[model samples]
Target chain A: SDSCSEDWVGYQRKCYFISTVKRSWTSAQNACSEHGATLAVIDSEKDMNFLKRYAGREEHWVGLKKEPGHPWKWSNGKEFNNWFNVTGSDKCVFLKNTEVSSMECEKNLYWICNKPY
Target chain B: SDSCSEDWVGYQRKCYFISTVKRSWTSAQNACSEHGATLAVIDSEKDMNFLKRYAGREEHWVGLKKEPGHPWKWSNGKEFNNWFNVTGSDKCVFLKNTEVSSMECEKNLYWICNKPY
Candidate 1:
């Protein structure tokens, strides 16, 4: 009975939960963490396309952020392989339908939570 | 994990297992049953589209089948609800890209299994 929650939108082998309230990057990360998941770490183009379409129009926070004076790293500390363009420096990342961009972590924004389901 | 095995294809809330062997409908049903699932049931149009595109030119056995002197039924013993047109009678159903047709259950064919994750 404990699988992908009702609020989760699933594709492939992942279950995504988009937050309703617009919260800061750190706040939203905590939200997903409390629910036993993490902020979405998009890896594949196919997964990205599915996320973009499923989250059309509204932008959502992803688990991408650069450490101070460093390159992007995922929540699991995997170094970014230049998968998608992130247009800002030293900031948290957010997904905009087609492309993903980075910004200050304090901005109130929606976010997506995902873990392999 | 046991959640959607490596060979399984997952979409939305369901886990699907497409058989590699071209087996009879009963054999395929038993195949899925032994694996702890039933033949795939196309409830959502999006789910159906995913299966259709994933299947391409090959035909796969689905859960729709007519009982002796009865209408088509799903794996859960639910009515077919006049959903997709079943173009034949007294047979098990198989999908070929866009259309689904029926034939005798003993033919060798691929199949899709569905249940929970």
Candidate 2:
């Protein structure tokens, strides 16, 4: 079936574009927004595992992040379930190897954009 | 660059083969042994995640098993660290979705084979 745009891959009826370059978490979110997309908001362990392997040793920024005096939420201000090995209480969420961790958002790293395919 | 053998895929310098049919844990191990392969012995989170997605929703037998009155060990005759959410105290080990579990070794199931490329 004709799905997604060039350089985008389809998964679970959605399209995802994994970046090859690095950017800050905020910048990463904007990069996706410019195209009317959103930074990858992992909704399930299946999605998390797939993205982890897609990154393959490279740290990739996901949509989940934290703000001062507030709980972690998706870039679009959505709630998240406690279902993963999230350990750090930092500002930005990223995946390294197998586990997800939160750290400084100002740092540059790879990112993923998700949209309906 | 060279590729894995027919019907086998490569990861972390090893070749893996996922069976299409169901068999008991012992029978599954034998299928791999007949081809000079052994049931998959996941050493790291990367290896586990890779195999987990390959199995998808199907419960697939792995190499880890507990003999009567013995601790769990790989088919390699070696014990491993606790890096997984492995539950259950049954004799045979298998993966379902994102977690591994131990169950009756005599039941039919798919399997993953690990071998040197």
Candidate 3:
């Protein structure tokens, strides 16, 4: 079948990897990149909703962040289409179990990885 | 990008189509076969959980049924690994929004299709 590799889930022409181990946002991004992927980029309610189901009770790191001269954007320079609620001035974002929330990039958490399926 | 065609969601080396219109189980199967696919064959909890998220409030047709001498099985002749609870003695199966349920084969419903990505 034309689908993702073992342990990966396919959606929207992309493969998603839900990590079980927790790591800092930076580390998580590095891990995904090492696997020829990147942290997930959520651009629609469908994406957000699908990912919400994949996330566990705890927050999961995703590929969204706010930086100087740039607001929330994906790691690959995609602009945020619809911003989910931001909790504070946190620089990074996570799939907040059932909702979206912002957190410091240094915070450790589970993460989701994405690549073209 | 190495990914699925437009409008198809990629998962586990396969692409899926969530139909927007209603059709009977046989009609839905034809619809998928006409497009070089078949009704989805769910194989794991991850698949089930992922598809559950894709389905809406209304029930959606999946490629499962209780055939003569075959009992419950996928359309492609794979045996049911773990049967979800059946609500009735209906022959065809559908993704019951948040769970799995069997229904009359003639009942019109939205359906999901699958093919190699």
Candidate 4:
């Protein structure tokens, strides 16, 4: 976390960031909301670098969330957070903990969020 | 496909598209590439139209792919295809055939891709 940058990464008219602290899926999402972004939707290589530094080479949270009732949506709905990937059926987003084998959405892990400002 | 437009949808400086024909995953991906996009990366509602009209309210392909050996990647690797939702695991990209019960990546389905230019 020593090399982490405070400046958000910008590209394609969007800004991105990764949560510094790991928290439950909900909490991570909330963190982005607090910062005016629901989750990070990476739109460029610069945004990817923001994630790398924010995540510090470890797995972290993304804007993807399980779609149980409706089609998928971003936390703030700025636009589609288009990088989330899942299995043959599952579609959702959460923090990715590189240290853990099983990931439950409820688990806390820092996530990324996007803002177009 | 009567309403399909010759132009791709643009949002946040990214563009997206959906193919009309149902082809296998590889074929769907190839379709997008053939049109100058690897797969659609929807960044906004405006871009969504290019897909809705292109897909005609049917489920089509997104730039998601199953990640087996390495981390997930986009067809052209422009930005991440973050809107893809799947099960607990299994990361990949293919066209979503609305009429099919079984979705094998080999099955051809039109997909969406993005271009930052």
Candidate 3, B1-97: lDDT as tens digits: 0117877888888888888889999999999999888888887777888777778687889988775323477877777775566676788888854
Question: What is the DockQ score of candidate 3, to 2 decimals?
Answer: 0.02
Whole-model Cα lDDT per candidate?
0.78, 0.80, 0.80, 0.55
Over 4 Å off in model 4, which ranges? A1-6, A43-54, A78-84, A88-102, B1-117
Arrange candidates by TM-score, descending.
2, 1, 3, 4
Tens digits of per-residue lDDT for model 2, B1-117: 011776678888889988889999989999999978888988766688788878878899999988887777887777754556568868888996677788899989989999765
Model 1: how far residue B117 lies from native, Å: 3.4
Question: All candidates' TM-scores?
Answer: 0.47, 0.48, 0.47, 0.39
Best by the DockQ measure: 4
Chain A TM-scores for all candidates read 0.86, 0.88, 0.87, 0.62
Native interface contacts kept by each candidate, as a fraction: 0.00, 0.00, 0.00, 0.00
Q: Where does candidate 1 stray beyond 4 Å?
A: A1-117, B1-3
Instruction: Summarize candidate 4's per-residue lDDT along A6-39 as a digit string, tens digits.
Output: 4876555777665567787677777778877766
User: By summed lDDT, which 10 consecutive residues of candidate 1 chain B come out lowest?
Assistant: B1-10
Query: Per-residue alpha-carbon lDDT of model 2 for A1-117, expressed as tens digits?
Result: 111776677788678888878999999999989977788888887888788888778788989886553456787778666577577757788985676787799989988888765
